[PDB]
Design a protein around this ligand. Structure first.
Ligand SMILES: *CC(=O)c1c(C)c(C(=O)c2ccc(F)cc2)n2ccccc12
Ligand SMILES: *CC(=O)c1c(C)c(C(=O)c2ccc(F)cc2)n2ccccc12
Lengths: 304, 304
């Protein structure tokens, strides 16, 4: 029993972290096979960060200008290319520690672990979610760029995020491993607004199921609702509209606990209309939305 | 910027996780050099768990009865001994993946990462704290026993916890790596009360500093207090009494922000007396006490 915001073990990803220095800029790289993936803003000085012409800036760079370091050994760059907002540095050595991996682009609401790194060295690991406005709420200082977000399925690491930016709002923006930013964000030092951040309804519901499984039942009530009645309430509180797909994905949790999904929706509706009244759910005083139904099933069943 | 409940990278500890089966019981072991450390309740059947005589039960066990498996290879047990509530299995092979390590017994209020494991395989990593009542609030299902708690200092892993038990209250109890339980807990299937869990005041204060550093300032006020006046308020809310040592440890945070420790104490006193009033601090609706002053300094400075 017990319910915690848990991250995947980070070992497979630690063995891929390298340091990439270009000019005077140092950030993190991801070494998989003979390729180091890193943000393309590594070629930028602070002046050209206001409005960079990456294609023009890259012309002035050669293989020897990209310094890649794995722990203490220098990797030899034999090729370089730009793929959207990531630079791909071909090195002469395949990473001996390369895990089985995939590059996946995730949907908002989905969760992933982040291995925060500085100078190619990992400092910590935390669990977070791709917000519906395509930002993440992480912990990223200067030098953390190139830190990756990922998931694990037994032995295969599914890389989904690469950190590139902090918006003036303190939230984080980044790309998938093909260099495509999540959301409308661009790798430029310009005023970019994050957009309305809504709450991931399917995740709050899953977390309510995890709470019931782990003992917290005070929020359970004698009421039920409909998808349309609940969604009227969801809209009012800036919650994601709940669809039949969401109800389907909550099926295993609904079945395990014996609580129908629309009954849990009525509990959530009352929590939204009345607040917690000074109480907590799984040690939290607010409705947690960074646990997908898959996270709850996995944590309550011990999938290794 | 940004502040997250961050765990240490778990790679160094993943390379130490093994599976230990004794009779029909399977739990996790920690392989460091030629020794596998695991809970001694591995030799127990469910019947003798009510009141085990571990010395008598251990007599009936030989080296060959302890099955140790690292990933897929079987380790050869050439010796076995009981040290308090841990069994120490001497294997014929030193773990090639043994990191630089220490065994430390931690104080309540101190935080550590837990690598939750099942069948010697890691499922996840989370950050938690040794509560003042010597319990931890983790996530541990059946088979998680032998999962360890640890800290990292550059390359040296300081093992502090080994999971042994879940109290009927859903909280967790375990030992240091010498087999000595934190708190008054015994490895028996008997009614054990956890004790009053107080809030770690020095940690809440550190987290308030982290909040100011990261933008959250609404809770800052025009008041100050004294150690004795604040402690009167702390007692009323079951908060740990704040000492001069605590004020000293908050020195670097106090200096960085320019906010004196007793001024932050007055902010905390008002938060305790008036609540959050529907507001949040670092995305939390309650006062977080699982970030030590060292955790805040480390996370706000990027120590790898
Ligand atoms: C994240 C990181 O390590 C980093 C950033 C964000 C910058 C930077 O100045 C910048 C990049 C992108 C952007 F849109 C605005 C500003 N870095 C410069 C030098 C090293 C590391 C970083
Ligand atoms: C934690 C774990 O894997 C485990 C426990 C807790 C027990 C068990 O039955 C027990 C141990 C200690 C105690 F005081 C009461 C009950 N296990 C039995 C078999 C495998 C794993 C575990």
């Amino acid at each position: 029993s017990g319910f915690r915001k848990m991250a995947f073990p980070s070992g497979k990803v630690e063995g891929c972290m390298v340091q990439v220095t270009c000019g005077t800029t140092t950030l993190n790289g991801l070494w998989l096979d003979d390729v180091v993936y890193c943000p393309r803003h590594v070629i930028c000085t602070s002046e050209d960060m206001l409005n960079p012409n990456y294609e023009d800036l890259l012309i002035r760079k050669s293989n020897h200008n990209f310094l890649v370091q794995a722990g203490n050994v220098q990797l030899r760059v034999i090729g370089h290319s730009m793929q959207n907002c990531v630079l791909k540095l071909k090195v002469d050595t395949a990473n001996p520690k390369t895990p089985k991996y995939k590059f996946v682009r995730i949907q908002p609401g989905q969760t992933f672990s982040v291995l925060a790194c500085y100078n190619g060295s990992p400092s910590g690991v935390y669990q977070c979610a791709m917000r519906p406005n395509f930002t993440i709420k992480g912990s990223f200082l200067n030098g953390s760029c190139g830190s990756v977000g990922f998931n694990i399925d037994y032995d295969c690491v599914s890389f989904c995020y690469m950190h590139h930016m902090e918006l003036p709002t303190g939230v984080h923006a980044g790309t998938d491993l093909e260099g495509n930013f999540y959301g409308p964000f661009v790798d430029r030092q310009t005023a970019q607004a994050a957009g309305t951040d809504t709450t991931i309804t399917v995740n709050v519901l899953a977390w309510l199921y995890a709470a019931v499984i782990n003992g917290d039942r005070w929020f359970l009530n004698r009421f039920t609702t409909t998808l349309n009645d609940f969604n009227l309430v969801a809209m009012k509180y800036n919650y994601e509209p709940l669809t039949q797909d969401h109800v389907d994905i909550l099926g295993p949790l609904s079945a395990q606990t014996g609580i129908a999904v629309l009954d849990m929706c009525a509990s959530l509706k009352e929590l939204l209309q009345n607040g917690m009244n000074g109480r907590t759910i799984l040690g939290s005083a607010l409705l947690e939305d960074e646990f997908t139904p898959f996270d709850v099933v996995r944590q309550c069943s011990g999938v290794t």
